[PDB]
């Protein structure tokens with residue numbers, strides 16, 4: 001058996017989003033990024049000549065990216081933000097009493113504590129494994145999945161799961 | 164006399180900002196970008212061997228970028244947004260009655276009608292000529308200034324002035 | 327009125343194709359490329375804040391690229407190739423008596439004399455103006471259209487039309 | 490002793506080739522790519538200041554690439570292609586009865602089952618170790634060799650050998 | 653606990669320097685490079701949402717780069733160079749009796765034997781750990797630090813320390 | 816007749832050199848760069864399908880680059896440097912009385928006043944037209960030649976000649 005590592009990466013695997021980091025003692029101003037995602041995986045080359053078809057990987061990365069793209073990333077588990085539902089908006093009040101309000105539909109509520117690159121990457125990795133499907137990955141012999149997310153190309157975070 | 168065209172471009176000449184486009188009949192959701200700026204100019208090579216010192220160009224592009232970076236870009240002349248001052252926030256009401264509110268300090272109020280790439284580029288070009296200084300540019304023989312702004316590397320707008 | 331130049335460019339605006347150059351006294355071996363296309367245009371910024379919406383440009387460039395992608399590029403006007411229809415194949419006989427045969431469906435018959443970068447670019451430019459629609463371009467004030475095609479990133483050809 | 494990992498990568502380490510994937514139940518149309526190869530290795534830094542001279546690595550990667558470049562990649566061990574010698578051509582008949590014919594000299598016969606990125610990478614890795622020479626690699630303390638091949642920059646396969 | 657790997661990389665993390673390689677039996681001519689440095693590290697994501705703040709990493713990489721930038725790199729432990737102090741210059745005499753002389757202030761004396769990419773990388777790694785501070789890295793849970801240095805983008809050396 | 820513009824650009828069209836800028840009132844420290852050159856030209860597409868064969872352009876750009884590569888760039892017409900021949904070295908004395916000495920063979924004597932990007936570009940343009948040959952360019956209908964030189968990718972100078 002022959003192991004290969006596949007990498008799919010593209011300026012297409014992007015989500016252009018607004019965010020701000022907040023944690024204990026720190027809040028920054030609202031801004032945004034063209035976030036980019038790459039996926040790496042390892043398995044044995046199968047009888048058909050592939051570890052797993054690149055086209056499936058690309059389809060599923062684009063799908064996950066598209067869910068995030070063109071929204072404000074709202075970290076629904078933050079311990080330093082007060083997230084209120086007001087009519088059809090989310091109102092966010094910070095530790096320093098700063099207030100934001102956005103239409104709910106402009107936001108993507110993500111089960112993270114901070115909109116950091118690291119926590120966004122963990123979320124995406126989990127979503128990708130779900131979307132490609134873990135049993136399907138195992139049929140293809142895949143035993144390692146790894147996502148890299150960048151806020152900007154100069155700063156990236158990479159997370160993995162052995163499966 | 165020998166003409167040369169200088170180009171300065173860098174992932175450093177960036178402003179990571181939130182925005183949304185609105186015009187008659189169209190509003191999009193809040194999102195953001197790593198905007199990037201390049202500057203091109205033309206003049207004669209001077210006796211010192213330069214058209215104009217690259218380091219001055221870089222300093223002034225970084226300065227203009229830094230003013231925008233890490234904010235929401237607020238187009239203060241939009242004919243389809245109602246921009247209200249509420250306490251220490253800007254409240255923005257759209258044609259479709261969508262409402263946003265952001266701390267004033269999180270916003271940069273820019274004298275444009277739309278936060279399009281084109282209008283942002285025009286603004287930056289004007290600011291750059293002011294910051295480098297038009298009489299200084301003329302002492303160096305510069306007769307053409309051109310800015311390229313990208314929301315994402317795949318889509319760029321370029322504007323110029325003959326001076 | 328304010329002129330802007332728009333550029334759309336992406337590793338997505340690709341057509342991965344087989345070809346070979348043939349002209350009088352020269353034939354090369356069958357090979358291929360990841361061809362890439364960029365589009366540049368000029369017009370006035372309209373009241374909506376755009377010269378013309380980038381999304382329309384991207385949609386139409388992708389459409390033209392997709393027609394070419396994943397085929398052999400067959401220059402149907404070559405004066406040095408004998409192009410025969412044999413059953414459901416094209417059989418190509420060269421000046422040096424070299425012979426090729428490919429299923430017709432694997433080929434894209436393009437109204438060019440040589441599969442050079444230059445002639446491919448001319449073809450794409452014409453197709454793009456047709457697909458975006460010339461009257462529509464004129465409604466947006468566009469007066470210049472320019473395509474760059476590369477066989478490989480190190481060698482590109484650029485063609486334009488004033489409209 | 491101090492371990493270092495060397496990487497050599499260049500748009501020069503390219504082979505511009507035609508191919509098509511075929512496996513049980515699947516055939517695609519003839520097309521091509523600018524394939525790109527990078528080489529990574531690990532060893533101890535030697536007394537001369539290098540793990541192994543980059544110039545040797547580059548020379549040998551270019552040599553292997555040049556053997557493939559500008560041809561159709563013919564997978565000589567495919568279980569779904571019927572590969573016939575007809576005069577000075579190879580005639581290829583597929584499971585769906587599609588037929589191709591190319592001059593033999595336009596083809597590179599490679600001891601692989603599929604012209605996938607993965608199997609091409611395995612072939613290149615083996616060829617590179619042969620060309621650099623395994624005993625020479627061991628004199629330099631090299632204990633790991635790894636090749637990355639891309640059909641297009643967005644999709645890459647990486648294979649390695651511990652030596 | 654969740655491990656993440658952070659990467660910071662930028663054309664900004666550059667040192668534009670002159671050098672030449674010399675070892676037993678080999679001297680090359682004086683030349684230079686735009687050297688580039690990237691830093692990778694691993695640790696657990698902390699309660700604040702980061703492994704360690706990217707801004708600290710960037711600040712410290714820029715600081716180390718700036719110390720080297722715009723000088724001749726003088727390997728002070730070379731066994732094949734005779735390094736003499738002459739007035740306010742360093743005079744370097746080679747095995748082949750070639751002689752150089754540079755103002756001392758134009759040189760950076762680095763505790764390496766050869767100005768190879770590998771040895772420069774080792775030096776930078778050590779300097780970076782000192783500048784970020786090893787106890788601080790350990791407070792953040794960082795257990796792995798890795799530097800990549802390139803003389804040119806096509807040839808890179810990577811070194812690491814487990815901490 | 817159909818005009819096309821050809822561009823050839825590659826990390827291969829490089830010269831890795833040492834230099835320093837000096838002009839009246841300014842001297843900088845010795846350092847270096849991976850300089851890069853691109854060539855753009857315009858002409859009509861000829862009957863063979865090319866403006867001019869890319870391979871000729873590439874060959875001649877590589878040749879010019881190779882002459883400069885791996886040396887100190889010595890501006891032989893500087894009005895602020897005293898350039899002395901001492902044995903088999905060049906000794907350079909600056910306005911501030913700084914002194915350098917390099918073997919003559921490590922230097923390329925270039926007929927420029929400053930080793931600026933602009934003046935290096937002018938020199939390269941002239942050399943390229945000579946190497947490709949002006950009458951040959953005219954046989955191909957070429958009427959415009961343009962060189963871009965960068966010290967680093969963030970700062971480029973472009974010069975042209977109408978022919």
Ligand SMILES: Nc1nc(=O)c2[nH]c(=O)cnc2[nH]1
Nearest residue numbers: 116117702703704705706707
């Ligand atoms: N580690 C880290 N992750 C981030 O997402 C991050 N974002 C910032 O804006 C500043 N530092 C950061 N540092």
Ligand SMILES: Nc1nc(=O)c2[nH]c(=O)cnc2[nH]1
Nearest residue numbers: 279280376377378379380381
């Ligand atoms: N021309 C143009 N300029 C933009 O800034 C723009 N932004 C978008 O989000 C979509 N289309 C655009 N089209």
Ligand SMILES: Nc1nc(=O)c2[nH]c(=O)cnc2[nH]1
Nearest residue numbers: 442443865866867868869870
């Ligand atoms: N001008 C030019 N156009 C091409 O498409 C081209 N293709 C080649 O393979 C070699 N030279 C070329 N030269």
Ligand SMILES: Nc1nc(=O)c2[nH]c(=O)cnc2[nH]1
Nearest residue numbers: 050051052053054055605606
């Ligand atoms: N894993 C994988 N390897 C390939 O070479 C490949 N080529 C394709 O055209 C489509 N999917 C692929 N998938």
Ligand SMILES: Nc1nc(=O)c2[nH]c(=O)cnc2[nH]1
Nearest residue numbers: 539540541542543544768769
């Ligand atoms: N391994 C290696 N390291 C270098 O820094 C290096 N520099 C050169 O100029 C030529 N070969 C090299 N080889």
Ligand SMILES: Nc1nc(=O)c2[nH]c(=O)cnc2[nH]1
Nearest residue numbers: 213214215216217218931932
């Ligand atoms: N115009 C310009 N040309 C150069 O070559 C240049 N080099 C520098 O080091 C600093 N500024 C520069 N400015």
Ligand SMILES: [Zn+2]
Nearest residue numbers: 019031033151
């Ligand atoms: Zn951010």
Ligand SMILES: [Zn+2]
Nearest residue numbers: 182194196314
């Ligand atoms: Zn946008």
Ligand SMILES: [Zn+2]
Nearest residue numbers: 345357359477
């Ligand atoms: Zn070709």
Ligand SMILES: [Zn+2]
Nearest residue numbers: 508520522640
């Ligand atoms: Zn393919």
Ligand SMILES: [Zn+2]
Nearest residue numbers: 671683685803
């Ligand atoms: Zn070097």
Ligand SMILES: [Zn+2]
Nearest residue numbers: 834846848966
């Ligand atoms: Zn310099």
